[PDB]
Amino acid sequence: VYAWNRKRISNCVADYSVLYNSASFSTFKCYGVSPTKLNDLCFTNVYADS
């Protein structure tokens, strides 16, 4: 956790509905966006911290 994996995400056609409907995640908490209506929304780049 003190050396969390950092990933750059860009240049994709990324579907997030499959992640929401997977139901294998105990917690899915989103701030600034909604779990739904996010497929048609996009930004310049994505940062992933694991």
Place this chain on the structure above:
Amino acid sequence: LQDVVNQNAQALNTLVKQLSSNFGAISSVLNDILSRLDPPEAEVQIDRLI
């Protein structure tokens, strides 16, 4: 006459500029908030904007 015309124009311009204020919300434009937020949070932001 120039002074009263300028006063009216300044009031209109001030209203137009004030239309682009966040008012404590995440964004100053309503379309982005509507397209980004779920109905409850979007409702709160619209309340603040109104």
Place this chain on the structure above:
Amino acid sequence: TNGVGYQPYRVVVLSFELLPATVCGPKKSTNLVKNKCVNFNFNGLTGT
């Protein structure tokens, strides 16, 4: 043996920022139309 309060949990955090769009989701594009009041979605910018 650890309970739900101490069991391991894998966490991924996704962060975005708005400062041209490069990665966009699975929204099918539509042919451009002019000279009529229509709804447009340009890189996530929604307007009419």
